[PDB]
Amino acid sequence: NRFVKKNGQCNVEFTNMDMFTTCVDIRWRYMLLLFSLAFLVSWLLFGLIFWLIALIHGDLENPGGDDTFKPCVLQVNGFVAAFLFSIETQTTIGYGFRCVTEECPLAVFMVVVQSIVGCIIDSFMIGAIMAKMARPKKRAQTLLFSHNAVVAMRDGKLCLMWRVGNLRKSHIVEAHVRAQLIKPRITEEGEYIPLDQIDIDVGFDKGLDRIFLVSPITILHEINEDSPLFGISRQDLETDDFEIVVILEGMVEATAMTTQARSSYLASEILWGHRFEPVLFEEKNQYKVDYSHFHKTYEVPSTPRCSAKDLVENKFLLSNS
Amino acid sequence: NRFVKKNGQCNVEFTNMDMFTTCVDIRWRYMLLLFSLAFLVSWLLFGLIFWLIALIHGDLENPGGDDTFKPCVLQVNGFVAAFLFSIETQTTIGYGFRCVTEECPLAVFMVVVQSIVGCIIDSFMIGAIMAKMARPKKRAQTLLFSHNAVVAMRDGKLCLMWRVGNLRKSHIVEAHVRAQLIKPRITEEGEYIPLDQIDIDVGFDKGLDRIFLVSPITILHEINEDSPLFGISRQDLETDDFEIVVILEGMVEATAMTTQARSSYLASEILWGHRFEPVLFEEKNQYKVDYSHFHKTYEVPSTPRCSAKDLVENKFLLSNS
Amino acid sequence: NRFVKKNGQCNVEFTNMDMFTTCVDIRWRYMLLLFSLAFLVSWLLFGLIFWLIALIHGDLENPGGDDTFKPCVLQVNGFVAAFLFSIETQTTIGYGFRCVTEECPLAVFMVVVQSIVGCIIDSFMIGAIMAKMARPKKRAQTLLFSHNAVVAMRDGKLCLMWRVGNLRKSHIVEAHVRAQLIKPRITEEGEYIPLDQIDIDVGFDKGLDRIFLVSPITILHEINEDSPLFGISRQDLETDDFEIVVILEGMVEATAMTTQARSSYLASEILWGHRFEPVLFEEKNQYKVDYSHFHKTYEVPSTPRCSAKDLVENKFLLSNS
Amino acid sequence: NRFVKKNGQCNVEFTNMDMFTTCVDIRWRYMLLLFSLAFLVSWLLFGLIFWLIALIHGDLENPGGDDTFKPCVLQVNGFVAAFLFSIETQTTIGYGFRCVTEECPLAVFMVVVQSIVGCIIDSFMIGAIMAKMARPKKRAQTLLFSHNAVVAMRDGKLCLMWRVGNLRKSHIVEAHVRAQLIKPRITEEGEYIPLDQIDIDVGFDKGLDRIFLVSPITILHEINEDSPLFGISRQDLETDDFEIVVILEGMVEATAMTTQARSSYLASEILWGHRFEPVLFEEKNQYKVDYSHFHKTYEVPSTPRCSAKDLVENKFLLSNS
Ligand SMILES: [K+]
Ligand SMILES: [K+]
Ligand SMILES: [K+]
Ligand SMILES: [K+]
Ligand SMILES: [K+]
Structure with a gap:
């Protein structure tokens, strides 16, 4: 329906x-x-x-x-x-x-x-x-982020994913998402950027970062040649010193004020080779959202353990030689 | 004038x-x-x-x-x-x-x-x-969506169309539109996305989704190679399980608050081979909007009954062979 | 200074x-x-x-x-x-x-x-x-549009231009401009669009439509191959039935509300072969804006009287033959 | 951490x-x-x-x-x-x-x-x-701009840089930056534009001008072929009559109103061959921002004294001849 x-x-x-x-x-x-x-x-x-x-x-x-x-x-x-x-x-x-x-x-x-x-x-x-x-200040958080991020395979592309949900029935006008990998780095000319912020692409150039958040949604980030995650396998993941930040801005109908929901994922918090447990079921003539499966994942052993950078390099030989 | x-x-x-x-x-x-x-x-x-x-x-x-x-x-x-x-x-x-x-x-x-x-x-x-x-909550809907969507032919391109109108004389500051096909789908790696939301292109990359809504306007969606509707003919339409959602956000001068007008069209609600009845007539020295023809359509038998995907494939032979 | x-x-x-x-x-x-x-x-x-x-x-x-x-x-x-x-x-x-x-x-x-x-x-x-x-409604217009539009030549390109000015010392946060040619037209498949609105390009795809409006500014619209004005010469101008609408939205610091300043130009109101009289003069150690020259233009006889479409076609022979 | x-x-x-x-x-x-x-x-x-x-x-x-x-x-x-x-x-x-x-x-x-x-x-x-x-008007400036701009070399590209900082712990929702070179110029057809404003590119077409301003950030402007600064060396800098303006708009959680922080840099205020002193240090289990190093720079003698336009032209011979 x-x-x-x-x-x-x-x-x-x-x-x-x-x-x-x-x-x-x-x-x-x-x-x-x-x-x-x-x-x-x-x-x-x-x-x-x-x-x-x-x-x-x-x-x-x-x-x-x-x-x-x-x-x-x-x-x-x-x-x-x-x-x-x-x-x-x-x-x-x-x-x-x-x-x-x-x-x-x-x-x-x-x-x-x-x-x-x-x-x-x-x-x-x-x-x-x-x-x-x-004019108070403790406006109760109405937006919700999954506890962990997940890197799995969707439609043939390797992506980093995380969930977002509206804790209220009220809508979020003009809502969009953003992510970015935060890690310290030294420039080519040798320069120290303490905590460098690098944009994680979630769809900005096509407007796909604009969301219509009714029931919870899974935000995708295809890890490609242009990703700050392009060369990271599952093993690298249990060693790295990076942190991914996630934002969800928009106009919240309830508090009727422009909001900025945030959250984070340390390399140690993103579960490789997983997938989120559905949360939307159709109870016939109306849909339901079992908000208990929000942070629930599940293994997908058929998921590549190598980095997206290598996953692609290999594809050539088995297409080439 | x-x-x-x-x-x-x-x-x-x-x-x-x-x-x-x-x-x-x-x-x-x-x-x-x-x-x-x-x-x-x-x-x-x-x-x-x-x-x-x-x-x-x-x-x-x-x-x-x-x-x-x-x-x-x-x-x-x-x-x-x-x-x-x-x-x-x-x-x-x-x-x-x-x-x-x-x-x-x-x-x-x-x-x-x-x-x-x-x-x-x-x-x-x-x-x-x-x-x-x-600070109430029953702000009377000032924005209006046609009852049905229509797929017809405009300027040689096959498009899905729907109407939007401002029920008030007051304007809508910074107003833009969005649409998206909502249907359940299983991914390549076999994954269940209950209610997957797929963007329907209405002009975002050129800014053409930005509207100046005085008299009602007909929103167009060219069904091309990149459309989630590319391969749908009139017959397919009387069978499919999809639903198209339509949003119109903007700043409403009256309620002076950021708005989000919504609506929907089930495959069964979009009238193929039609066109909207005009609503704007010039009574000389002033324009009028007969808001009674808002949801009124009319058949256009010269409209292709095949899908946009096939309409194009054929064009090649009669240009080729 | x-x-x-x-x-x-x-x-x-x-x-x-x-x-x-x-x-x-x-x-x-x-x-x-x-x-x-x-x-x-x-x-x-x-x-x-x-x-x-x-x-x-x-x-x-x-x-x-x-x-x-x-x-x-x-x-x-x-x-x-x-x-x-x-x-x-x-x-x-x-x-x-x-x-x-x-x-x-x-x-x-x-x-x-x-x-x-x-x-x-x-x-x-x-x-x-x-x-x-x-919460009143007669908020005094703080934004101002020149009385007439002008088509002249700037930096080798033929453009339609018009002025905008902030009547107050207060700023306009996140301000952007838009224009669009409004004329009735019949589609290819023969369809009547009473008052069709066609976007006039003023810089959206590069963000150049975003303005920092302190002293008045002249808004430009290069008339190119992609313009609804591409094939219009000076003579055509004293005959056509079109009207150009101009918007300037943004956040007005004074009324602290999102604004939408408007205005119009009938073909008969846009002065071909002109240019605006400066309004900004430096009185040394401070700038002044003689708001009396706001709507003042002045002839530029060295301005092509033919359409931008023809101006370009000719350029080929004198480069070709 | x-x-x-x-x-x-x-x-x-x-x-x-x-x-x-x-x-x-x-x-x-x-x-x-x-x-x-x-x-x-x-x-x-x-x-x-x-x-x-x-x-x-x-x-x-x-x-x-x-x-x-x-x-x-x-x-x-x-x-x-x-x-x-x-x-x-x-x-x-x-x-x-x-x-x-x-x-x-x-x-x-x-x-x-x-x-x-x-x-x-x-x-x-x-x-x-x-x-x-x-409804007052003297809302205390919560946003801060470095005193001087700096042109140095980062990751092999020559860029103009300047700092921005949030003086409060409160966030800035939907914050973005803009810059533009302001100088008087005469057009090709000989026309006087008193104070012409030319956009300085800081990332708009990729959305990189959108910032998440927690600790102070250094805003970059790669001086390339498309820059109004492309042909400026260090010597030219101690002679030119230009001025760069910098804006930082966004929604300030505190004053809960759309803001527009501004500032300027005359050619004489941008320090060539420098770099900003870090301001973010990790005191283990929490980060600190020594806001005293905000406007502090430091020489980098290994920095090219020629313009970005020449820096590139030369690269060809030592790659070519
Ligand atoms: K008494
Ligand atoms: K008494
Ligand atoms: K009393
Ligand atoms: K008494
Ligand atoms: K774009």
């Missing part, structure tokens, strides 16, 4: 799966004690200003008032009272017991200022709880 | 169209009962703390006060009264009947704490109603 | 320049009357509920209370009073004159519900004033 | 490192005095409306009320009192001393209007402190 329904839907089911720009991530909760501190500080500073005004205006001795004396802010009889009035103005609770009167222009202007400072102070709380909220 | 005005505007009119990172989409409205619950819980817990303080401080028996006794919070005569005071502090309504006094440092600090917890609690409500708001 | 300082800075100065997913752009201000209406409605509905409770509980006749009778909400003596209490609870002003008492569990729960509905109602106001704010 | 752990983690340690759309960036803090002004203005205008109502309704002479006279808003005895009531309604503090009564439908409707205007006014404060917060 269908692999892709007439509307894009993919017919597969997965199974058996296991300045202050640094403020955005200013911390985990050191930001919450930072804000709760921003409050306390402005609440105290203003509680102090109002207490100073109540001190000098002579209110502390006639907090309620007379027909002759009107306080700046009613009921500010001390600092705990001044502190509370301050809090009540900013939080905008304003219980009302402590209340500004129209007596001191200073107190009025102080209430006007604490209202703006207060509105600004928490318009930022929503801006920080916005950065540190709408 | 003009197809593209001197300022980009396109001269066409369309007609007849039919951790908690999972919190972002934590639900539909199970989040609203989640918040309305976050409230109720903090309102009750604090109402309890204040009621405990009013219990131990001996206020429940003298809620208003004397010249000798001052409660921690005036008018907390019970738990419903304690509950209300709690609510009033956080919501910041503070009617004022229930009011903190400057007596118990504990009660003062409790009001200071409930104000911060409260401000934090709803700074997050705006952060969640922000994720689940500024 | 330097065109690009050692740190990226570019040494040029410009002168003489002239479901409800549709809710995001739900309107201009029909959204503000939408919210101010959302308020009024919930304020009235609740004012009604509280007035109903005050009606049935018998408060309307004893709004203040006795030592024997306690209202649900003090001072609700009518509907205007009930309306106000409702408003005061949601806005969270709570002047205090109208105040909930701990008498009716219904009234308490009604205040609890109006507080949550109210907090939700305006957490959305910030979410809508967020969509319709952080 | 490993350069890339089996899960993507990279085994390297760095050391020794030194309309109103313009409102988004409407300013630094001229926006805060803009808002604090938006407040003051609406607070004053409404304080005026309420004072006008209290004037005409005759309240200023009976602010508290009688059993015969009920004010529109209790306690508005002047403009400072009217001003305060206004502030208290919008901020939603509502101390309660100044309170609306159900007498004047006008005053009620005025409180209803100031509540909506007020809620709108600061829903925007969160929208502006959102633009100017979640």
Whole structure:
């Protein structure tokens, strides 16, 4: 049956799966004690200003008032009272017991200022709880690489192969693969390149490195005359000091951000003479992906143990002589 | 007249169209009962703390006060009264009947704490109603694929064709197409590739797969020596077990996100010997797109019923012998 | 001197320049009357509920209370009073004159519900004033195309040319150009392609279509054997029914979004035998771009009036015979 | 050991490192005095409306009320009192001393209007402190270019080289390089191209310009027959008027935005006959990058002082004659 329904839907089911720009991530909760501190500080500073005004205006001795004396802010009889009035103005609770009167222009202007400072102070709380909220970093790896690489024979050509799989049902827009052999080398003119990176060809010049990754796929690398692996047999493999790196970039629909899945294979991790265990089976009227066979291989004794470079050289005599 | 005005505007009119990172989409409205619950819980817990303080401080028996006794919070005569005071502090309504006094440092600090917890609690409500708001998933498909593929003859070459159309007036930035024949196959060395994906060439090596999709366009695939369709005649078509997948990626101006429109054609869905009904007509001084002829085809009996592989082989004798 | 300082800075100065997913752009201000209406409605509905409770509980006749009778909400003596209490609870002003008492569990729960509905109602106001704010559509065109195309002779090759310029000092990341001749044509097998789009080659196979657009640049299109313009002389130009479209895609640093600048040239708009007036002059120790010469051309009478197809055919005899 | 752990983690340690759309960036803090002004203005205008109502309704002479006279808003005895009531309604503090009564439908409707205007006014404060917060411009350069370019001999080919390094541990998704020689030139038909940009080949046609930039990398440019540097010897270098520009675009994981790192090299800045000092050393069981040797070169006297064009011409005689 269908692999892709007439509307894009993919017919597969997965199974058996296991300045202050640094403020955005200013911390985990050191930001919450930072804000709760921003409050306390402005609440105290203003509680102090109002207490100073109540001190000098002579209110502390006639907090309620007379027909002759009107306080700046009613009921500010001390600092705990001044502190509370301050809090009540900013939080905008304003219980009302402590209340500004129209007596001191200073107190009025102080209430006007604490209202703006207060509105600004928490318009930022929503801006920080916005950065540190709408922008994490531990995006769970949705892409998966086989544990080992395999060199076997496909369609008469000797290739290095490795698997890639989408752990999610979500797609990867404009996805492509890359590989490269990393080993230290000395140039002709005698020069030391510590860790030289050499491209491993997986299809770039024909666009074949562009993949449509629904169910897991096996990535191929034909080992030919132009390969940094051309002259490597199975024995050479259990001795060499090289490492192959594998990348899979693309646009991940889920995290909706351009991704770069990576992984590696040391010569000691690539299994020669093997093949991957299928993972896609058709359960009739729908396909399934037994994600348990993902890293599973299996011997193929009919696989040449010599290098691709020699495999070809020999072919000539048995065609020539 | 003009197809593209001197300022980009396109001269066409369309007609007849039919951790908690999972919190972002934590639900539909199970989040609203989640918040309305976050409230109720903090309102009750604090109402309890204040009621405990009013219990131990001996206020429940003298809620208003004397010249000798001052409660921690005036008018907390019970738990419903304690509950209300709690609510009033956080919501910041503070009617004022229930009011903190400057007596118990504990009660003062409790009001200071409930104000911060409260401000934090709803700074997050705006952060969640922000994720689940500024990031959906049912983005309406703006791209459209013809219902069937067609194999006919254009400019002396035999090609597989299919249509694509932009359902919106909005453009698709950097848009390109891809196709690929999906069928199971056994390799030379005898190996089972369940669902092998084989690229169908639509112009990648010349950049011709890059499209400027205003009015619908017909995508062509010349069936040549290098095609996975090279040896398929019309009869073979009513028997084969293959499926062709079609992708159209690009940057959609509307959803302003990289898209991947898909679709499929089973051998049984591609109409041999046909051609698409035009959809673009010039109503003089402006072009129109009768989107009703989108999936409409029409027979072309002068179309070869043999495969492209044979069509070419024959050409030699009638040129040779 | 330097065109690009050692740190990226570019040494040029410009002168003489002239479901409800549709809710995001739900309107201009029909959204503000939408919210101010959302308020009024919930304020009235609740004012009604509280007035109903005050009606049935018998408060309307004893709004203040006795030592024997306690209202649900003090001072609700009518509907205007009930309306106000409702408003005061949601806005969270709570002047205090109208105040909930701990008498009716219904009234308490009604205040609890109006507080949550109210907090939700305006957490959305910030979410809508967020969509319709952080996502417009009239992004001012920052890219500019010359008014006319020009066909002249450069380095011995006959080319079609047109200008492109960045109206801003900001750069265009990964910018590339494209052109294509749009004209209706009938295929060999006699088929009508209304508006056929034919790629005009500007350097894709060598990557030369990739541009680093600081000061304006002249885009070239060598008219060769492979051009849809190969057989067009100056006379043919004052008769043909073709139109050339020009695109310039890339990532615009300013609008930080993938862009697609467009434009067009009808045969009647491309000036044969011309050349663009320079726009870049070095005012010593800094470069300037007189953006007034942008669309200015100038005759070059030594320019062949015949087509590129003929220009080449002739070259043979005067090299041959 | 490993350069890339089996899960993507990279085994390297760095050391020794030194309309109103313009409102988004409407300013630094001229926006805060803009808002604090938006407040003051609406607070004053409404304080005026309420004072006008209290004037005409005759309240200023009976602010508290009688059993015969009920004010529109209790306690508005002047403009400072009217001003305060206004502030208290919008901020939603509502101390309660100044309170609306159900007498004047006008005053009620005025409180209803100031509540909506007020809620709108600061829903925007969160929208502006959102633009100017979640979108800066001084993104710290994370990419680094060597101070000088070097022309030396690698693997028998004469190349122009320069270094690039990631100043962060974070990766660069889909990263590629570009270079181009910028010099003024006069065309064959005699035409003045002020500052002509000529591509310097760094591997585009094989995809070798695509880099996986972990530890710093040396970018190569083989100077061959096709190079705009083919005919330049060391002497010519201390005379020429050319400048080479270098770009490194890619997707930077940190700023999560498409980047374009730039830099330049005047003929006088490219050191002939040199080589870069290594920067990658293996401290056993982990690699290190001594970022202090980044711009450090060193003479290689065995380096040809003649141009690549001549170096090749000579090779013929000593192979020929
Ligand atoms: K309040
Ligand atoms: K109050
Ligand atoms: K190519
Ligand atoms: K309030
Ligand atoms: K209040």
